[PDB]
Write a protein that binds this DNA or RNA. Sequence first.
DNA 1: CGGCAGTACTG
DNA 2: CAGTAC
DNA 3: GCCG
Length: 321
Amino acid sequence: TNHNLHITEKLEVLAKAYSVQGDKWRALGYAKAINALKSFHKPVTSYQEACSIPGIGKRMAEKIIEILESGHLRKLDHISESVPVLELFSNIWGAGTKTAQMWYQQGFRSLEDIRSQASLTTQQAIGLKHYSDFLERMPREEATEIEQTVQKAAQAFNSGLLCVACGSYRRGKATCGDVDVLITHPDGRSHRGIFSRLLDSLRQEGFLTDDLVKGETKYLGVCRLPGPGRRHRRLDIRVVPYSEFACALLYFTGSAHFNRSMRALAKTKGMSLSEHALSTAVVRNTHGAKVGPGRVLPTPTEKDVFRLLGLPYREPAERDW
DNA sequence: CGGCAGTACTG
DNA sequence: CAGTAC
DNA sequence: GCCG
Ligand SMILES: Cc1cn([C@H]2C[C@H](O)[C@@H](COP(=O)(O)OP(=O)(O)OP(=O)(O)O)O2)c(=O)[nH]c1=O
Ligand SMILES: [Ca+2]
Ligand code: NA
Ligand code: NA
């Protein structure tokens, strides 16, 4: 639950304004502060109580106080008039802040302008054609149907293939922004040849409607279940070796902020965590950049990753931040 | 002062 | 590479 | 934006 809604509702506006305008680090600080404020027990009442929470500094506490005594945040009144347009433009899949800012500088103000005059990448044209659909979340039951469709298509090639939807779905959420399907095989090797033939099977069946990204082990695209009343949905599919399964599962399950916290912690302990592996004895320079590789640590299960980092295990539902 | 996660596709 | 995305 |  959140007992600081009257504060966070105002902060989210500012954080989004900073995000679409490209000030990503300031936005990150706002996001983190907003999460910290949602994850609390008591409505904040003092500048001193505010600064005590992790993720809240003097500036953010000043803002919270201006909120408690006045009910309003003056800074909301000086957001640039371009921000709603930038948000509109960057909600196109494949367009971000830089593209939105360029479109805005060219004088474009609406999606009709984009459709008729803008130069679009292949991805951005798919994103525009599904603009409304991609802003919607689906019921988890539909995510289940999409996962089962992928699983049944994959297990037709090799019965031994394991398929797991990993994302807000695995974290137990009632709705899902897209479906994240991780595929492996405990053999350790048969996963190698199935990916392209799987995608051919799904697009031959009419399930896949558009491709966004096509790597050797990574796919991002668009699907739609058959029959009436169905929307187009974003679908991400990864195929990983069994030895990397635990770390791929952890990454793909998220949340994103959870992953960043876990990876930041690993960095403090001279380790490095990615979707491939947890590594130890990684040599870095004075800027936190990697100059030497280190060695992979055995992580047969998600619990092993937590254990090697000195943390208590957190269930997927407990990984929202 | 200066990092803020680590990776992968596109063109 | 810069931009964008998971 | 925050924080070491
Ligand atoms: C966006 C993003 C995702 N991820 C990881 C964590 C996510 O659980 C996983 C899938 O990405 P998403 O599908 O974007 O994450 P989600 O499932 O939580 O969002 P939604 O419910 O709206 O569909 O990828 C990152 O590590 N970093 C990122 O920036
Ligand atoms: Ca998802
Ligand atoms: Na604090
Ligand atoms: Na976008």
